[PDB]
């Protein structure tokens, strides 16, 4: 978190940090139902928007 | 608004003339060794294709 | 009031006797079934709409079952337009109108009893690992629906423990020549080819493979759609099963439940088909495809989609026998993979060795 | 069905080889080309049309014989592709029913 404050202070932008729904890092979990499955966890939330 | 448009909307003068030439040109070279048989005559019932 | 219309003069003789036979087949409380056959002949929509309207206008029949003799699906679109015209439920059991037609017009009541390529494309992969046929190649011919066949191919191969390999070509031109066709036929990197061919070009493409020197049981092919080289697999979708009297009886069995599906909530018997063109209006219509989701009959689910095609079928796969005959080999009834011809003695039955030297025990 | 009674008794009674259709003056739900497409297409007779813009008559699976002179509504997307290029646009959001 401390590193984030350094970047923002020298880049002129703001933030509002929120945790992830489930504390699991992004993984594939290939189930093939939804066209070769889909992501989850933190890295699944990034691509959604 | 930057909508689109058709040049000849709801027009039939050119299309009617154009449709004649394509068929007429094709008929000119249609005379070949292959069958030039007309479609079946009569409207009671048929199976031939 | 039902319309059991058939196709072909040969079906007229059995149509008369099948009337009483299917009348007593299915009985439901507060329901009367009056089968009506027809002696009409001809594939053109000339007698297919004139006297058919007389059944609608005069007999006031609801629910039509169509049986066709020839394997030309040219008559399938004919009833599709008519189904959405008077908003009358139309179901075709089998015949020419067997292949699924998509997309269909809105508010279309046509029901098709056919299995699309999607369900067929599933059972083939199970028998591949059953007989250890992981290596395969899929090819196709110019068709309106070759995009779907190729699009799903990578979906199944994405998963599973064993590693799949895929290859193939894009199209083929029979008019180019046998040598030209065989020139591109040498790009072989597997033991089995999967081809998306049509009925009209099925015979020429089989003769095209003759020049490739692949006719014996040493090489096999699988047929997708509806001098024969050995080792051919086909699907019938109960085409050769359930006879015909049982098949035609089930056409009205679903309708009776569908009629009872709406009658329990409210009492209303539609009379939309009572007149063909006596009214210049077709606005009055509701629940056109609201029915036929959960239908149980003959201990088999009869679920249908919005397009109007069976989604829970009992498909049967048919192999090619050395006496130039086709017999069922695998049975697929409600996600069952029991099969027959047990997998033992690999590289033997259904595919003979090309060389009897590299295969050793 | 009113005009479907003359799909062959009148249209092909002259032993014609093609049928030309147009959008009806009444702006209804473009119902005029359905009978000719099924009937004349059943005989494998190609049909032509004018003032026709519907993407439903595109693939050969439902309509094997159909050659409309006027391209359908779906071609309006292609024009926008080059249009935004000279205005230096890279990211887009579409509103499509």
Which key features would you list for this structure?
part of a larger assembly, 4 chains, A: 49 residues, 33% helix, 0% strand, C: 361 residues, alpha/beta, six-stranded mixed β-sheet, 14% strand, Glutamate receptor ionotropic, NMDA 1 (chain B), Glutamate receptor ionotropic, NMDA 2D (chain C)
Descriptive notes:
The structure is cut from a larger assembly and holds 3 copies of chain A and 1 copy of chain C (361 residues). With 49 residues, chain A is mainly alpha-helical. Chain A contains 2 helices and no strands. Chain A starts with a helix and ends with a helix. Chain C has 8 helices and 12 strands. In chain C, helix 1 crosses helix 8. Chains in contact: A-C, B-C, B-D, C-D. Chains B and D meet through helix 1 of B and helix 2 of D.
Give the structural class of chain A.
Answer: mainly alpha
What is the radius of gyration of chain A?
Answer: 15 Å
Structural class of chain C: alpha/beta
Shape of chain A: elongated
* Helix amount of chain C: 25-40%
How far from one another are the termini of chain A?
A: 21 Å
DSSP strand content of chain C: 5-15%
User: How many DSSP H or I helices of chain A?
Assistant: 2
Portion in beta strands of chain A: under 5%
N→C terminal distance of chain C: 66 Å
**CA radius of gyration of chain C:** 23 Å
**What's the number of helices of chain C?**
8
How is the quaternary structure best described?
Answer: part of a larger assembly
Question: Got a strand count of chain A?
Answer: 0
Shape of chain C: elongated
Overall helicity of chain A:
25-40%
What's the SSE blueprint?
The structure is cut from a larger assembly and holds three copies of chain A and one copy of chain C (361 residues).
Chain A: H1 2-9, H2 41-48
Chain C: E1 3-5, H1 10-23, H2 50-59, E2 64-67, H3 76-83, E3 90-94, E4 110-112, H4 117-130, E5 137-138, H5 146-158, H6 178-183, E6 192-195, H7 199-211, E7 220-223, E8 232-235, H8 245-265, E9 296-297, E10 300-301, E11 314-321, E12 325-333
Parallel strand pairs in C: 1-2, 2-3, 3-4, 5-6, 6-7, 7-8
Antiparallel strand pairs in C: 8-11, 9-10, 11-12
Helix pairs in contact in C: 1-8
Organism (chain A): Homo sapiens (Human)
Protein name (chain A): Glutamate receptor ionotropic, NMDA 1
Subcellular location (chain A): Cell membrane; Postsynaptic cell membrane; Postsynaptic density membrane; Synaptic cell membrane
